[PDB]
Design a protein around this ligand. Sequence first.
Ligand SMILES: [Cl-]
Ligand SMILES: [Cl-]
Length: 469
Amino acid sequence: AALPQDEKLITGQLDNGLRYMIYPHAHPKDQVNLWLQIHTGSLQEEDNELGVAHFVEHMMFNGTKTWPGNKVIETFESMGLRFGRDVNAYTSYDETVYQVSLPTTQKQNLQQVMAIFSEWSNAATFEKLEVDAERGVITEEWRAHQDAKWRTSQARRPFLLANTRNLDREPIGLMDTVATVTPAQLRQFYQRWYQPNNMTFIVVGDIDSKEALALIKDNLSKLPANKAAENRVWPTKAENHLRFNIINDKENRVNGIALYYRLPMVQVNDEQSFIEQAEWSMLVQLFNQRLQERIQSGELKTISGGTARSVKIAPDYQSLFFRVNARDDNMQDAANALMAELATIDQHGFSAEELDDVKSTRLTWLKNAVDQQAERDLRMLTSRLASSSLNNTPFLSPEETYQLSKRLWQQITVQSLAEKWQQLRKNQDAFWEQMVNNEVAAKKALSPAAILALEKEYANKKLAAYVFP
Ligand SMILES: [Cl-]
Ligand SMILES: [Cl-]
């Protein structure tokens, strides 16, 4: 049974195939976000196109038919719109998005911005001199972003992205492709993927339905009805092997231990998939709740903190990890705390009071989210709608989210979660990870045999059931 989209959301398609999504919002008043979403990122690049989706994105600000060279930037600047502030763009594995935020009070400026979007759609020129200028830009940005977080992501990457197309398609690409790719090759990718049926224009902000629909139709319906190439899908394959990693980086600020599981990610488009996602989310929250209760009650002063989280790793896949942050260089205490909590849940699961508290506090938040919906952050709301568009999943209103949760969560029990926990714990696609920032913590890090001997020790213990306070 298909989920309804927010009552206030306006969706549709122009005759040329371009899709649009309009959502009214008046916080801040007289502000609108205009985003052009290309449903193609780095995943679709051929072996000789590594970083071309990202290079194409940069080329939108360096020449169009009406605005050659720096004229697109000079036009935005004449309307008080600055690159990196009001005007932005990004390329990910899944998409390329072009973003403009401006007031709604100057109608000629709204029209001017729409005229620029029309030319980014099919009239970018890729001038030789401009392409050559951007090679240096991309090369410098590639080096600049190589910080501790990037080095940690690079080290985790083979473990986290095993058997994904994402592993071979990091958006920055190769500097050797950036240096040699011809303007004709950049033009080829652009004309292959930048066609109306692979585009969604998103309007979020303080504009009425009639005016927003007219902005789109008056400026984007004349784009020729060309069909883009089909976006290919690479199904992620399980890696039924337990792996181990130690990330040693002196610039990282937190030492700790984590267990990562990799599993399919269901798209929330019906009642059954809404329940499946809610069960993984609740297992994650219940873990977090128990750890925080043990820390605040004073039971765990041997550790600093920790979390459980789910992360998207590919269009069809996710990782669920359980992390405990170490107190200084005390790697043994971190491992002990994590293993002890995972084994306690293995043996007794969660209580009816623990689940009842997670549900009631989430419903309280959801109810208040309905009451305060007019005050939602514009940027966050635009991002959620862009995400629904990318995943072809219904964009639920705060009211639908609240009503669905109140009704569908009654199918979530201590028994249904115990089943899901046992399934997750038998998942062979897993890896242990430790993070160290000095040679004392590095010497203290557990080797793989020690990790598993600690797991066996806890598995064979008759551990006591946790009692919700
Ligand atoms: Cl990247
Ligand atoms: Cl194994």
